[PDB]
Amino acid sequence: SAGDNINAKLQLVMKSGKYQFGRKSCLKALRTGKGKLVIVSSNCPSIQRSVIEYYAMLSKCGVHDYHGDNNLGTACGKLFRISCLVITDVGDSDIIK
Amino acid sequence: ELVFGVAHIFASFNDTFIHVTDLSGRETLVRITGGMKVKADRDESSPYAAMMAAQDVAARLKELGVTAIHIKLRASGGTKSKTPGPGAQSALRALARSGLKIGRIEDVTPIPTDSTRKKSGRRGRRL
Amino acid sequence: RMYGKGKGISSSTLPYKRKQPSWLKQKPSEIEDAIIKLAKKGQTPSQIGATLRDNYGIPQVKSVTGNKILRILRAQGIATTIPEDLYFLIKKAVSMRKHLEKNKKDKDCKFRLILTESKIHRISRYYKRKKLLPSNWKYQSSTASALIA
Amino acid sequence: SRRTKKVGLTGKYGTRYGSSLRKQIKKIELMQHAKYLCTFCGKTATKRTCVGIWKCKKCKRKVCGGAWSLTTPAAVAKSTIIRL
Amino acid sequence: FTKKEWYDLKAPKMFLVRNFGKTLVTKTIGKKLATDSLKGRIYEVNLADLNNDEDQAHKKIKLSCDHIINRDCYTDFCGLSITRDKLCSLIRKGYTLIEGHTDVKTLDNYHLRMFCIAFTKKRQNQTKSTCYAQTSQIKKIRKKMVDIMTAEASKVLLKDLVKKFIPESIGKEIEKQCKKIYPLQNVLIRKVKILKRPKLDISKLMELHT
Amino acid sequence: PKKRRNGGRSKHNRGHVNPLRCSNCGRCVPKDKAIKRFNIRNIVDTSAQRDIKEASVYSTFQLPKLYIKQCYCVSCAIHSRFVRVRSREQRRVRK
Amino acid sequence: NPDPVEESKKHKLKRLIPTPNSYFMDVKCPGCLQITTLFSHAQNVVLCGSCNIMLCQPTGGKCKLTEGCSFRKKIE
RNA sequence: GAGGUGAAAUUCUUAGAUUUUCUGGAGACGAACAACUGCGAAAGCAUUUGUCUAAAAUACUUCCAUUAAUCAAGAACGAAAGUUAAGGGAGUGAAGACGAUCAGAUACCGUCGUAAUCUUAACCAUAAACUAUGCCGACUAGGUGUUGGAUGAAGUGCUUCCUUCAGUACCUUAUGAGAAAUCAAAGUCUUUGGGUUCUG
């Protein structure tokens, strides 16, 4: 029972706070600095992982590899592959610490 | 000056193997059993056969010079029976009355931790 | 018991006293304020009531406030669109389906999946018997993963 | 509607060849022709191209495998290798 | 036969008698060296008959020959196990039986696989027939016992290990630690086996024998 | 009829048991039915025991106490006089 | 005469008239001097208000409390 | 000379069988602990370890607010045996060969030995699948236990006793029953009706 915590936190944050996902959208968020933390899928191509992680460390933001693959669609509430998440406005959730 | 030798006594409801070996456990000294003693095709495990064979090996070992004997008791096998055969007690009695030095007696009859199927089917034997 | 055997008579019994406890002085206004804030902070209503009873000491909310917990949560529009029990049971359903796809040999898992999905259909029929659910719900086993929202 | 009861994909062979060799063959081509999930993209779009190569339409990144199964018990020794 | 010669045996220095018996070897004719056949055998002697004491009549140690000069051999520790009669006599119904084993590599690059047998305790005030413990309790017993044994079985050398098997300073501390969780009864080490040993070390073996 | 209340086996809240084999005949019997005797018989009879003891050494050597734990099927048990038919009114009494 | 029964405490829960075995307590921490309210047979951990310290170990029974303190049944 | 038997024979054995001991392989199984003990709806499930998954029991001043019971149709699992396809194939071992005993013996007994038994993927849906007692629900009588809890008290943070749950058996009693054997449920039935299905 390790990833159940992150699953629940993501479930709460989708209800509670503004969210953006998609490669171009997350790039824009990290460039403008609005992003607060990024969730990256495990099976995402290594180039995307490297570029997102480098941009995060340059822009002073968090980063978190998910426990599983790019089937975060079943967890995030959508119905399609997503493979990357940027949380622009954390709502009332315990994801920061 | 005291020297020890192993004596395997194998009693399996039949011929009582007497097998005196070097204390190490290889290159045995004298193997007599009970078969070549009784020619009646029966009573191999009878006390008479074991007693006389044991007294013969006692005389032979007196001649050789070894006196101290450890005892290793084996009975049939892990798949046929579990109790020592009738002739084992007679062999022990004969070795006691022989005059040979006796050491330690121990049981080495194999005990199967597994449950390998033994002879006769589910209905079992009929005698 | 619904399945297997065993009555399991263990449960919780509410006290004979139905008014507010005489020692209590806390006011409902702050009681509803605190419950709304916490249920927004994130917790399902059963444990919401549990933590209200434990950490906050407001026994018999139906007595200390003139309304029940689900109704005071829903009256502000924050109400979850699926009931607590059905949501939890569907989560269990998707969990053992995720396991059984990996392992097609677990026969007791198959048994309990059949049992739980029968319970799912029964409870869904009950909840749509009232006006407490969209009438178009069918719960196909395909979109069960994302149906939790 | 359902044009056939049980023959299914092997109806292309007509009445020739015995049932003990048609039911036997049907066991495998059903899961051969069906597309498979791709690890590299998560899109179930990997088909067959030859006797031993599977290709994802989305990835355009082909992977070797068995004759008709992308994975097989003889190929699930990766767990023993990877436990190290 | 009449072509064989006596061969006395020797044991490492720490023991009390260091000389228990005489083995037998065939003649010295070719093409055998009359030494390779002697080498690589196994032994069995009571620790009671090797230390002249009654208390230690329930354990036996195998000895494997490792070096030969002149007439007397040198042997080496090869295996420890328990006597079958006391092994059986310990086990009786009404108590659950606890078994444990693991593999530990020693400080001397030696691999020894060992077993322990444990029993429950009636104690005084239970006034009942059965004396069984919970499955989780037994699992904790097994985990704690393996963790305890591996420390003192790896941090020391094999000579110190085999000497510490003489006063049995393992079971006493096993009992002391398990006192705080669940009381036990007579607990011991059933069998020791040599999983693997490196090549011959003449210098170390001869210094340990002297 | 229902001659025996427990059905010749302690089977209760159980579905199946691992079956063992009879020592004598080899027939398969479930564990909770076969007669079991946990037996402690000496290696040799006392007559030879005496001579062994005073022909032994250390003056404290003790002869081993062997263990058996043997089992028997119903038919072999009743054949080898391991059990008695007893009487109906007494049949219920065990110990 | 089962109606005026008196010693039915020893009887199982949901006796003649159901009555919970639980109760509420007021705990005073020794040397910390603060007031708070606590529920016996709770199911979640609790910390004080004045100084954040560990109170209870939640178990299926009546909770473990702390080594010291003075708890009084707040029942009226 | 060895297996062998109530005997004997078949069989193996001067090319060293049976037997002691050491090393490597294989397959099987997990005894002794083990029980009128546990879990599983049922068939079943006893070495250790890790992962994943479920269920039940207690306690609750937590929620839901009638969401329940049994079921024609239907569905899921379903011992051994058997069949299909690969693997694997020790031991046992339907077939069969034999050697015996026998008035004869195709069998009981003895030697060998094929299908099989074991693993993966599917069928087959039958058993004395037996507490032969369908399931749910209230009541009537006590004791002895015993498995897992929970409460209070005491031999010394630990160990027993008091009480109470859920199982779970046993022993006695029935102005209860029945044809009896017997049964605390097969009882609360001519003073005949708690609900429900199936069957003769």
Q: What's the SSE pattern of chain G? A: EEE
Strand order of the largest sheet of chain F: 1-2
What is the name of the CATH architecture of chain G?
A: Single Sheet
Radius of gyration of chain F: 20 Å
Task: Determine the number of helices of chain G (DSSP H or I, runs of at least 4 residues).
Answer: 0
Helix/strand order of chain F, N-terminal first: EEEHEHH
Sheet with the most strands, sense and barrel status of chain G: 3 strands, antiparallel
CATH topology of chain G, by name, is N-terminal domain of TfIIb
Q: State which percent range the strand residues of chain G make up.
A: 15-25%
Gross morphology of chain G: elongated
Protein name (chain B): 40S ribosomal protein S11
Keywords (chain B): Ribonucleoprotein, Ribosomal protein
GO molecular function, one term (chain B): structural constituent of ribosome
Family (chain B): Belongs to the universal ribosomal protein uS11 family.
Polypeptide structure, described:
This is part of a larger assembly, with seven protein chains of seven kinds. Chain B has a single domain (1-127), classed as Nucleotidyltransferase, domain 5 (2-Layer Sandwich), CATH 3.30.420.80. Chain B is built from two helices and five strands, in the order E-E-E-H-E-H-E. Chain B has helices spanning 47-64, 86-98, and strands at 4-10, 17-22, 30-31, 68-74, 102-107. The longest helix of chain B has 18 residues, at 47-64. The radius of gyration of chain B is 16 Å and the shape is globular. Chain D is an alpha+beta fold and 84 residues long. In chain D, 24% of the residues lie in helices and 12% in strands. Chain D has two helices and three strands; from the N terminus they run H-E-E-E-H. Chain D has helices spanning 19-33, 78-82, and strands at residues 46-48, 53-56, 62-64. In chain D, a hairpin with a 5-residue loop joins strand 2 and strand 3. The termini of chain D are far apart. Chain G has one domain: Ribosomal protein S27 (N-terminal domain of TfIIb, Single Sheet), CATH 2.20.25.100. Chain G contains no helices and three strands. At the B-F interface, helix 2 and strand 5 of B face helix 1 of F. The structure holds one RNA strand of 200 nucleotides. Chain B: Belongs to the universal ribosomal protein uS11 family. Chain B: Keywords: Ribonucleoprotein, Ribosomal protein. Chain B: This is 40S ribosomal protein S11.
Feature tags:
part of a larger assembly; 7 chains; D: 84 residues; alpha+beta; three-stranded antiparallel beta sheet; 12% strand; extended; F: first zn-finger domain of poly(adp-ribose) polymerase-1; two-stranded antiparallel sheet; two-stranded antiparallel ribbon; elongated; RNA-binding; 40S ribosomal protein S11 (chain B); ribosomal protein (chain B); structural constituent of ribosome (chain B); ribonucleoprotein (chain B)
